[PDB]
């Protein structure tokens, strides 16, 4: 099978310059077309170029042309990308998509083969830690608890519940970028009205870019 | 360049019906090369359709795609619950390369009335200098509704940022979170903090109130 595993999540300071790999395991590497795909949050894909790496036949998109320049390492089967002048703009999962094989290994030109992506936020916040702040059920069937994770960059953090033990009912918002550079989001629970007296509920909020592990308890008013 | 427009928006389906999705392109495609990728929230695209008419290895025999020059379709012959996600187009031209923005296929269900929540800003927060004012409508159906905050019933406008959940996997439901950030001393200002909602599941808008320290 083949596989595609990228590099870690980035944070850059604009007119900066980026770099993400992408390592390929299984198939053919020298001879199939790697890619590089963006998309922005809750927007469309957008292909930047791709290469072949037999003859480092290299292919941009217009709009990266002179911005974006795609190499290949043939002897660890790795594709690179790296970008320079990044703006907010170019805040996105960067994506590495090699294109499929046909009848004998014949290319399909269609990206078939992806990799897990890899998160480039540009932007000159720096990065802060969140507060996690309890959202406390109200003195009232069901009731709704949760934890509010505020004022943290970059992305992303991970909210559980009891440390895993609590998936039923939660909902965990996706985070909005405040008026400043900060992000914020909420996790809720709803959970039986009775049990708020003889059952805890914690909230494990982990933030790896400031490595922050922050465990709130959320108790009644 | 071309540009890949798909339609509809967001189709709303249940599990055994057929779904045809439209992807037009702004001048004439080269020799059949379009191709359909499915992509579910927090993973990357699956190859769906390559070449106008080629089904990917493994996709399922139930996903076929047609089309010629500027207009191309993708049809789900018997929708599946794994088959409600994301569907782009895309036009593999030469030295250039598009997408559409996307079609959505969420599961129908009957609609429901979201379950209203108010959260005060907690003291750990004010001693902070800030306050957030929490507005939660739990699992409802369809996604558009409508939240107003009020301070001591007055509208507010510009304060307040919310945020929806992809449709749960289980039931349907979306859920919404609206926050409403205002300084320390506007919140120790006022005393009455409703938030309003209006959903197709409410016959009357339903108000979530409190007053300030109680
Ligand atoms: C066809 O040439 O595939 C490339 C292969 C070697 O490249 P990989 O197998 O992809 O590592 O044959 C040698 O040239
Ligand atoms: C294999 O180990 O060597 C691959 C070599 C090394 O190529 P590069 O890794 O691209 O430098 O390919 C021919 O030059």
């Known amino acids: 099978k083949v596989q595609l595993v990228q590099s870690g999540a980035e944070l850059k300071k604009p007119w900066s310059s980026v770099r993400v790999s992408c390592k390929a395991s299984?198939?053919?590497?020298?001879?199939?077309?790697f890619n590089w795909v963006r998309q922005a949050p809750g927007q469309r894909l957008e292909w930047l170029g791709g290469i072949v790496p037999l003859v480092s036949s290299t292919n941009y998109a217009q709009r990266f042309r002179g911005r974006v320049t795609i190499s290949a390492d043939r002897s660890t089967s790795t594709v690179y990308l790296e970008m320079t002048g990044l703006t907010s703009a170019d805040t996105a999962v960067y994506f590495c998509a090699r294109e499929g094989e046909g009848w004998f290994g014949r290319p399909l030109r269609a990206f078939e083969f992806w990799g897990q992506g890899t998160l480039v936020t540009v932007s000159t916040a720096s990065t802060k830690g969140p507060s996690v702040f309890p959202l406390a059920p109200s003195s009232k069937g069901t009731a709704a608890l949760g934890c509010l994770v505020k004022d943290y960059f970059p992305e992303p953090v991970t909210v559980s519940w009891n440390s895993g033990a609590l998936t039923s009912g939660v909902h965990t918002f996706p985070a909005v970028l405040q008026s400043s550079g900060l992000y914020s989001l909420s996790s809720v629970v709803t959970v039986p009205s009775s049990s708020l007296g003889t059952q805890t509920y914690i909230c494990n909020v982990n933030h790896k870019p400031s490595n922050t592990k922050v465990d709130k308890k959320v108790e009644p008013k | 360049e071309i540009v890949l427009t798909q339609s509809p928006g967001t189709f709303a389906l249940s599990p055994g019906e057929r779904a045809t999705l439209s992807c037009r392109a702004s001048?004439?495609?080269?020799?059949?090369?379009l191709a359909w990728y499915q992509q579910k929230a927090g993973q990357a695209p699956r190859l769906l359709i390559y070449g106008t008419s080629g089904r990917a290895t493994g996709v399922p025999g139930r996903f076929s795609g047609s089309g010629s020059e500027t207009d191309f379709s993708l049809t789900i012959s018997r929708l599946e619950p794994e088959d409600f996600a994301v569907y782009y187009c895309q036009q593999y031209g030469t030295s250039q390369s598009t997408f559409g923005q996307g079609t959505r296929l969420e599961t129908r269900r009957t609609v429901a009335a979201p379950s209203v929540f108010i959260f005060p800003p907690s003291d750990e927060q004010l001693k902070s200098g800030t306050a957030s004012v929490v507005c939660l409508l739990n699992n409802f159906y369809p996604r558009e509704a409508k939240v107003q905050w009020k301070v001591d019933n007055a509208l507010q406008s510009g304060n307040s940022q919310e945020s929806v959940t992809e449709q749960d996997s289980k039931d349907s439901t979306y859920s919404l979170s609206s926050t409403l950030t205002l300084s320390k001393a506007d919140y120790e200002k006022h005393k009455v903090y409703a938030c309003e909602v209006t959903h197709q599941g409410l016959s009357s808008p339903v108000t979530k109130s409190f007053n300030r320290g109680e």
């Open positions: 001048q004439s495609v080269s020799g059949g090369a």
């Open positions: 299984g198939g053919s590497f020298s001879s199939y077309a």
